[PDB]
Each structure stands twice: as C-alpha cells, then as structure tokens.
C-alpha cells in the first residue's frame, strides 16, 4: 500500500478549485473557500472516507460523496450551529456556503449595509475598521 | 454537666494575645480542668500596596501595608458557669474573646 497506484492524481478539481493530491484528504479539502479543518473533518467522517489516505489516492465517487455531504449538511445530521450560514437573512435557511457562493453572500451583506446608510456599511465603504478598534496607531497601510 | 467549651481569641498584638492565652490556661489548670490548646491558626496578613505619590509624577514607588491578625483556639471540658467565671479575668485592649459550645 506504500507504493503509489497508477490512478494516483497529483491535482484534482472541486468547485473550480485546485486541490493538491499530495495533501491528506482532511486538509486537502480545506483549500475550498468556506471549508475549514473542523468542517472538513466532519464531512470526511460523515462520508465514511478513510482519513489516513491522501487526496489523490481516493476515487472520484468519494469526492462526489464529500460534495453531497457538504451541500446537504442537514441530511447527514450536521447540527445547525456547525454551519457558516445560519439563519439566512432572506431565505432564513441553514446551509454551508462555499466557493463563489460565499463571496456572493459577503457582497450581499456589505451592499445591504451600505444601501441603508448603516454605520457599519459606511465604515466598510470608507475602508476603516468596523469592530470598534482604535485607529490612531495601528492599521496603518495607506 | 461537662461540655467542650470553645474559646476563640483574636488580636493584632502577639504579646497581649499570648499573655491572655497563658492566663486562661493557668486559670483552667488551677480548677483541675482539662485544657486542649491553645491552637495557633495561620496568621492572617491583610496586605494593601498603594502608590506613595498623591499624583502621577516621579518614579512609581509603592508602600506595602500589612495588618496581621492572630487567632487562637482553646478548648475546655467543663460547665458553662466555670468557664464564664474563668473568662471574667481582666483582658487587655485589642484582644477579642468569644465563648461558644462545640
């Protein structure tokens, strides 16, 4: 088993993201935006993938299983508190957004804040800190 | 008509507290009573560290103020009347005497 199989893949694609084949599956999946070590770990656990294998060792069907697990956390008993999009503003649904969907959600939040002239939105627009930090001495880049 | 009378003595002066304890012990002994103690509890050291300056100028220098409280415990096996008579002896200022049962 120590010898690489002929099917070993050095580079694989998932949601238009390059995934390193040499990295372990748990930490290889983290290259996708919106997926971290905790979420990747639980997704691998729920998909029955063996955590000791590399990203390139597995088969494509296992990547599809991982993606369905990620896209339907509720179906696999992943709790609501474990998701990065809880109680959505418009739909009010709980889901794990990833890749360009995460950027779309972030842009929607920022533009919604800016449209109503909310203070946080104005701070975002001006390029200043939004979480109350002092700005006299730190955060100097331009 | 025999009870374990508990006597607690607290003071800031070691000499007066020790003298009062010795006087109580000798008084109890003179009556052929059984005396257990005096037991010296760990000294309580109240500590306050405050800046010397009444303002913010100069080297930050600090005063270490301590107030030491010494506590003693004495147990007597006798009736209430005899212990009350014994404790009636003169007690110098700064020594607090409390008498209880068990």
């Amino acid at each position: 088993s120590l010898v690489a199989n002929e099917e070993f893949q050095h580079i694989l694609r998932v949601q238009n993201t390059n995934v390193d084949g040499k990295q372990k599956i748990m930490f290889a999946m983290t290259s996708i935006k919106g997926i971290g070590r905790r979420f990747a770990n639980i997704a691998c656990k729920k998909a029955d993938i063996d955590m000791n294998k590399r990203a390139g060792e597995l088969s494509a069907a296992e990547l599809d299983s991982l993606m369905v697990v990620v896209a339907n956390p509720r179906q696999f008993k992943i709790p609501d508190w474990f998701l990065n999009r809880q109680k959505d503003y418009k739909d009010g649904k709980f889901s794990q957004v990833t890749s360009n969907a995460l950027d779309m959600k972030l842009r929607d939040d920022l533009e919604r804040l800016k449209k109503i002239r909310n203070h946080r939105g104005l701070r975002h627009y001006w390029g200043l800190r939004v979480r109350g930090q002092h700005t006299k001495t730190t955060g100097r880049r331009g | 008509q025999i009870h374990k009378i508990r006597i607690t003595l607290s003071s800031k002066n070691v000499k007066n507290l020790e003298k009062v304890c010795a006087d109580l012990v000798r008084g109890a002994k003179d009556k052929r009573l059984r005396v257990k103690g005096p037991v010296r509890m760990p000294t309580k050291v109240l500590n306050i560290t405050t800046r010397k300056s009444p303002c913010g100028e100069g080297t930050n220098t600090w005063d270490r103020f301590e107030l030491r409280v010494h506590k003693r415990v004495i147990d007597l096996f006798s009736s209430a009347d005899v212990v009350k008579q014994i404790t009636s002896i003169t007690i110098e200022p700064g020594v607090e005497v409390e008498v209880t049962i068990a």
Binding site: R37, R38, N41, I42, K45, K77, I78, P79, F82 | -
Partner: protein
C-alpha cells in the same frame, strides 16, 4: 497486581479496549462532531477517544472517590490560546464528563457518593484490578 503497580498509559489502553469489548457503553450521537473542550481547536484524532476518556475517568474515580463533573472539567482542561493575547486556563466539556459518568454508573462501576460526586464500587474495583492483572 493492581492498577497502582502498572503504568497509567498501558492500563488506560487496556481498560479502554475492555470497555469497548464489553458493549454496554452507549455512545451519544455527537461523539464524532464535538470537541473535548472549548479550548481545543480540533476534535480528538483517535476514533476511540470516548472509550479512552471513560477508562481514564474510571481510573481517576478509583484513585479518588469524591470527584464531580466540575472536577473532571478542571482535570481535563488546560491552556487556551487567545490569538494575540496571552494564554489562560480553561475548563473542558462538561457534557462529555456527565455522559461518561452516567454510562459508567449504568455498568455498576461507580455510584453516587453520600458526600457528593462519584465513588468506585466493589465491582468496579474488581474489574479494574483484573484488567491491571491481565496487562502483563
């Protein structure tokens, strides 16, 4: 030969294996999703972490018979990193400890101490002693 005469690590491994083989433990559904404490960054690496924790807790109760959930939270706590701020002690998960204590009680390994906490039963003493004896 008793538990005190064997290495704690080897005894913990042996007793975790024994507990798993027993089949009386009822692991909660969240064992594979929760961390062991707020101070942790990732879930336990070992898939058998629940049985190992139960064995360690049983050994602790065997050595001392007055521990409660808070005591076990302190025992399995540790430093918590705070990014750019210094580290401070942090307690571990209390739900895991409560569930493990209840499961161990269900197996007659420990019971409720009259003074509070949990105490090792005679059956628990016998089981741990036999496991330690078989380690050699």
């Amino acid at each position: 030969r008793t538990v005190k005469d064997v290495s704690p690590h080897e005894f913990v491994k042996a007793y975790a294996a024994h507990l798993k083989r027993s089949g009386k433990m009822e692991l909660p559904e969240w064992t594979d999703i929760v961390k062991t404490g707020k101070l942790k960054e990732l879930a336990p690496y070992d898939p058998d972490w629940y049985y190992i924790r139960a064995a360690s807790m049983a050994r602790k109760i065997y050595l001392r018979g007055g521990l409660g959930v808070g005591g076990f939270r302190r025992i399995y706590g540790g430093n918590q990193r705070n990014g750019s701020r210094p580290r401070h002690f942090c307690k571990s998960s209390g739900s895991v400890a409560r569930n493990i204590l209840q499961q161990l009680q269900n197996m007659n390994i420990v019971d409720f101490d009259p003074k509070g906490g949990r105490r090792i039963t005679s059956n628990g003493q016998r089981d741990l002693d036999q496991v330690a004896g078989r380690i050699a």
